[PDB]
UniProtKB/Swiss-Prot annotation:
Cysteines paired by S-S bonds: none
Quaternary structure (record): Homodimer.
UniProt function note: Cysteine protease that cleaves viral polyprotein and specific host proteins. It is responsible for the autocatalytic cleavage between the P1 and P2 regions, which is the first cleavage occurring in the polyprotein. Also cleaves the host translation initiation factor EIF4G1, in order to shut down the capped cellular mRNA translation. Inhibits the host nucleus-cytoplasm protein and RNA trafficking by cleaving host members of the nuclear pores. Counteracts stress granule formation probably by antagonizing its assembly or promoting its dissassembly.
Superkingdom of the source species: Viruses
UniProt protein name: Protease 2A
Active-site positions on this chain: 15, 33, 104
Origin species: Coxsackievirus A16 (strain G-10)
Reactions that this protein is recorded to catalyse: Selective cleavage of Tyr-|-Gly bond in the picornavirus polyprotein
Binding site for Zn(2+) 1: 50, 52, 110, 112
Length: 140
């Protein structure tokens, strides 16, 4: 589990969104596994605006923050799960690292701010849903 809190926005994995998130929906994209809902209180996170490929992510299944190198956001085939059938997930970045299903929502950060959240994994890989292209998160 986990979320990004920037401005009056809450960014979560679309497959983990709550019924309050859906009732207060701002934007969602199934192909990205992302959902953004509105919040009453202001958050403290800053979104990175960069092309960094190195950073640190939080892994709840190890209670550890791991430095990683990750690929640029791209269209990657993701096997069937209890949340989605087998499909192509877009804006996804991969790294060699540990992850388990409940690690989704763990933040990946670089020196500029939040880069994305854990969204997929398996076979010693961890996938992050990128949020750096969502410029509108920084305003209104
Ligand atoms: C100190 O947190 C670091 C540091 C490096 C890298 C990542 C984090 C995690 C983070 O930014 N959180 C707000 C924790 C909640 C979450 N959703 O992961
Ligand atoms: C961190 O996720 C891991 C890790 C290891 C093994 C399995 C998972 C769960 C996982 O990949 N999904 C539920 C897919 C979600 C999606 N974005 O389509
Ligand atoms: Zn950066």
């Amino acid at each position: 589990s986990g979320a990004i809190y920037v401005g009056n926005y809450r960014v979560v994995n679309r497959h983990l969104a709550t019924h309050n998130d859906w009732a207060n929906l701002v934007w969602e994209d199934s192909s990205r596994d992302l959902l953004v809902s509105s919040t009453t209180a202001q958050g403290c996170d800053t979104i990175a605006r960069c092309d960094c490929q190195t950073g640190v992510y939080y892994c709840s299944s190890r209670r550890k923050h791991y430095p990683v190198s990750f690929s640029k956001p791209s269209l990657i085939f993701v096997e069937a799960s209890e949340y989605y059938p087998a499909r192509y997930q877009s804006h996804l970045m991969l790294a060699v690292g540990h992850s388990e299903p409940g690690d989704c929502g763990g933040i990946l950060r670089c020196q500029h701010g939040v880069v994305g959240i854990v969204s997929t994994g398996g076979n010693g890989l961890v996938g992050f849903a990128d949020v750096r292209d969502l410029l509108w998160l920084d305003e209104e």
